[PDB]
Enzyme design. Structure first.
Site, mmCIF file in Angstrom:
data_model
loop_
_atom_site.group_PDB
_atom_site.id
_atom_site.type_symbol
_atom_site.label_atom_id
_atom_site.label_comp_id
_atom_site.label_asym_id
_atom_site.label_seq_id
_atom_site.Cartn_x
_atom_site.Cartn_y
_atom_site.Cartn_z
ATOM 1 N N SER A 1 0.618 -1.432 0.262
ATOM 2 C CA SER A 1 0.153 0.489 0.201
ATOM 3 C C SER A 1 0.654 1.573 -0.137
ATOM 4 C CB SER A 1 -1.610 -0.041 1.250
ATOM 5 O OG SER A 1 -1.359 1.638 1.201
ATOM 6 N N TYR B 1 -2.902 -1.531 10.374
ATOM 7 C CA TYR B 1 -2.654 -1.714 8.575
ATOM 8 C C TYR B 1 -1.460 -1.002 7.840
ATOM 9 C CZ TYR B 1 -3.752 -2.299 3.788
ATOM 10 O OH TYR B 1 -3.686 -2.740 2.436
#
Ligand SMILES: [Mg+2]
Ligand SMILES: [Mg+2]
Ligand SMILES: [Mg+2]
Ligand SMILES: [Mg+2]
Lengths: 243, 243
Positions: A150, A163
């Site tokens: 990400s 995350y």
């Protein structure tokens, strides 16, 4: 990138998170370029549906495995590898698309249990599954192991909590693996899909108009390039689907 | 860096891993520059010894807490914060030096349980402890939260397995925190001690001559600089003690 339709012909590729979203797209797309795809996911009937869609198009039904990354043990990961080894001589690719978002919000508020769950899926179970599949990957003439990253795995940002932490961990673990295999037949890399039209993206950005985003179909060229021989000299790298 | 002897005068700083090595050195050194040091570690009697050494030099015995990061719960971390809050109005600093190395060896061999233990100490418990101490840190006029990193937290290397993964996670979690506090009174950063004369270093490199390495004393200037007001404009960064 516009490869020939038989780029992946006869290459055996395991795709995790295959039930929907980018994982389902990559399973379909890999089968359409000649791959023998193996699906892994949480829900049996949802997997059956994706496998049936590929069967309807390719005329051979993909094998699937149900594995819950949140709760799985090292021995359960070894059972999958044993079951693949019984049907196939090698893995040519492993694409890890499974992931948990957990909570979006400030570190002062992050729930500890959700935080542990994110680490367990995105880091520890993805590691355990990887380790169990390394022997099969080494049987390939040019094996390719791909992790999902990400932008918040490269630069941390407010509210990305477990995350972001888990995607930094994913870059690290990918760099260790890539260094260990660097002069051998296995290459290891990450993909950052960027903002894509998925339920995970919508959960994080409820105001955003998903119809202004690229779909999982749009971002496939990179997914195809990393499993095909055109990427065979590239390892240890992290690629943006949408730079 | 050669600051005045009262750089840290009256600043209240919690030091984890304080029983030996770099953690014990920083506790001593912070007390010598005027800090009110709070020690955290695994073994009660080993902590008592460090605290007694500081008492022998400063004439006020530091408070200590026993906390086992491997097994601690969110509620146990909150109990520590509650116990600090009962004796002190603020934390001016938190230095996380506690860490587990786990196994050095190839990803094909990394023990899954040890791998989970490394993640639990270096990432999840260090997070849980941090979260419980953020309110006290925000009471400082210029709070400083420091994590311990490694060169293998910036670039992964063969055989560094869970450790490297957990130090990449530590850079990520430090970058999230630093972004969340960036325009407020709390700065957040990492320190990479580099190769230093410690039992952890010797375990990883059994052949190396530790007498050719810098000691924990040698690397203190950076540890002092991050807790003092000379670093107050710096956040989100990762610093090498030995560049
Ligand atoms: Mg919604
Ligand atoms: Mg070929
Ligand atoms: Mg030894
Ligand atoms: Mg001051």
């Amino acid at each position: 990138y516009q490869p020939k339709q038989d780029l992946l012909q006869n290459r055996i590729i395991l795709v995790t998170g295959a039930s929907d979203g980018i994982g389902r797209e990559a399973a379909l797309t890999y089968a359409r370029y000649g791959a023998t795809v193996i699906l892994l996911g949480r829900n049996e009937e949802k997997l059956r549906r994706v496998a049936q869609h590929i069967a309807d198009e390719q005329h051979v039904q993909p094998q699937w495995f149900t594995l819950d990354l949140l709760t799985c043990t090292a021995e359960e990961c070894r059972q999958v590898a044993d079951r693949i080894a019984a049907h196939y001589p090698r893995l040519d690719g492993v694409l890890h698309n499974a992931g948990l978002l957990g909570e979006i919000g400030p570190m002062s508020e992050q729930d500890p249990q959700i935080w542990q769950d994110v680490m367990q899926v995105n880091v520890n179970a993805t590691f355990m599954l990887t380790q169990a599949l390394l022997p099969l990957l080494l049987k390939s003439d040019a094996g390719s192991l791909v992790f999902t990253s990400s932008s918040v795995g490269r630069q941390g940002r407010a509210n990305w909590g477990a995350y972001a932490t888990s995607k930094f961990a994913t870059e690290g673990m990918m760099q260790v693996l890539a260094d260990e295999y660097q002069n051998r037949s296995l290459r290891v890399n990450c993909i950052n899909p960027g903002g894509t039209r998925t339920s995970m993206r919508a959960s994080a950005f409820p105001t955003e108009d998903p119809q202004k985003l690229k779909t999982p179909a749009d971002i496939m060229p990179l997914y195809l390039w990393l499993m095909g021989d055109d990427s065979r000299r590239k390892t240890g790298m992290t690629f943006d689907a949408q730079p």
